[PDB]
């Protein structure tokens, strides 16, 4: 970050700087970048978990333009407003992030079946949604949550929700927040540097889930990129106070 104060050479008189209004209405200050990134962002709203797959994959990466919906493009399982959340807007300004992320997973159920959440460290790929690892046709005998990777379990009858913190298990110093084109086919090792691993959710029977993400406490962002080209058409969707 370069403020540009270096280019402001005028030293003639100015009007007062006044007194800040921060804290006048309340002490709930909301300008800290880390504070903003620590409040949850909805990723998946009521998506399906199918036991015929290894599980539903969630790539470990913070919200940003990488998940932005564009009118006209193919329908994905990602909620459509991720790209306009304050935290995605902030992340679109920083290309580096290091630390843990926290996922709040809700299983829409009250059954006594355990649903497992398995953590996969950085392996090089970047996928999301239901997937049959190595394209097999049965996974209950070879469950990903029973292979040795760190796993946690949710039992809906006790609590249908859980909050898990995934570590920064990668070889790099920083994770790369975004690319100009999330679908470009370029050097494969670099392609996978935008995630630090995956979270895989596996059910016993078909059921739905919702997923939220936020920054952990041990988390930092950097490599400020400045603002991107933006657009807005808000004006058109509301009346002004003069009819």
């Amino acid at each position: 970050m370069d403020t540009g104060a270096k280019e402001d050479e005028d030293e003639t008189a100015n009007f007062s700087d006044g007194v800040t209004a921060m804290g006048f209405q309340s002490l709930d200050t909301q300008v800290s970048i880390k504070d903003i990134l620590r409040r949850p962002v909805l990723l998946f709203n009521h998506v399906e978990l199918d036991p015929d797959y290894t599980g539903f994959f969630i790539p470990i990466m913070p919200p940003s333009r990488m998940m932005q919906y564009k009118s006209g493009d193919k329908e994905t399982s990602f909620q459509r407003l991720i790209g306009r959340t304050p935290q995605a807007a902030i992340m679109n300004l920083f290309r580096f992030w290091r630390g843990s992320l926290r996922y709040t997973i809700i299983i829409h159920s009250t059954d006594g079946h355990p649903i497992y959440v398995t953590h996969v460290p950085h392996t090089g790929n970047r996928v999301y949604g239901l997937m049959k690892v190595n394209n097999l046709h049965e996974y209950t005998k070879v469950p990903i949550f029973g292979c040795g990777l760190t796993t946690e379990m949710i039992i809906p009858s006790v609590n249908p929700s859980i909050c898990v913190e995934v570590p920064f298990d990668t070889e790099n110093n920083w994770a790369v927040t975004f690319d100009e084109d999330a679908q470009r086919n370029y050097s494969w090792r670099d392609k996978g540097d935008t995630v630090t691993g995956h979270l895989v959710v596996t059910p016993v029977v078909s059921v739905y889930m919702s997923v939220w993400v936020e920054a952990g406490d041990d988390f930092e962002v950097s490599n400020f990129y400045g603002p991107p080209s933006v657009k807005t058409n808000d004006w058109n969707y509301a009346f002004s106070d003069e009819h």
Binding site: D181, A182, Q183, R184, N185, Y186, S187
Partner: peptide
């Protein structure tokens, strides 16, 4: 196929990214 996969040859380098010689990208 997917038009995002590869950048046209005249604007990119061997790494499938805009060439630093291609000034018109902006």
């Amino acid at each position: 196929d997917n038009p995002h996969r590869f950048l046209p040859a005249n604007v990119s380098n061997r790494w499938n990214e805009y060439s630093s010689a291609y000034l018109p990208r902006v």
